[PDB]
């Protein structure tokens, strides 16, 4: 899989903007930063959450 972006949809603000749980979601990338074709927002807290999950599952020993 090469992740050929997702392109920018703008007609009637069809990009959509709603926070999900943002962790363990697998939305094939497609994120946005605020301080299929589904995109949820990303904040820094979920970044710490899923990096904690990633380095916990990466180092089993």
């Amino acid at each position: 899989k090469v992740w050929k972006k997702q392109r920018l949809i703008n007609k009637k603000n069809q990009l959509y903007y709603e926070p999900l749980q943002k962790i363990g979601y697998q939305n094939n990338g497609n994120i946005q930063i605020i301080p299929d074709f589904k995109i949820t927002q990303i904040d820094e807290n979920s970044i710490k959450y899923d990096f904690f999950d990633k380095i916990y599952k990466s180092k089993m020993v």
Partner: protein, 42 residues
């Protein structure tokens, strides 16, 4: 030893907000398990 201070240290290092969003997008792109070791180190 801890990893919770590295993120605010990097935020102070970058400074610019939009570059921090781009770095967040790149790190999430790594996090979603498609990016190999070479891409993340480069």
């Amino acid at each position: 030893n801890e990893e919770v201070t590295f993120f605010e240290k990097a935020k102070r290092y970058i400074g610019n907000k939009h570059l921090y969003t781009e770095f967040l997008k790149i790190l999430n792109l790594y996090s979603q398990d498609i990016l190999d070791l070479d891409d993340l180190v480069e």
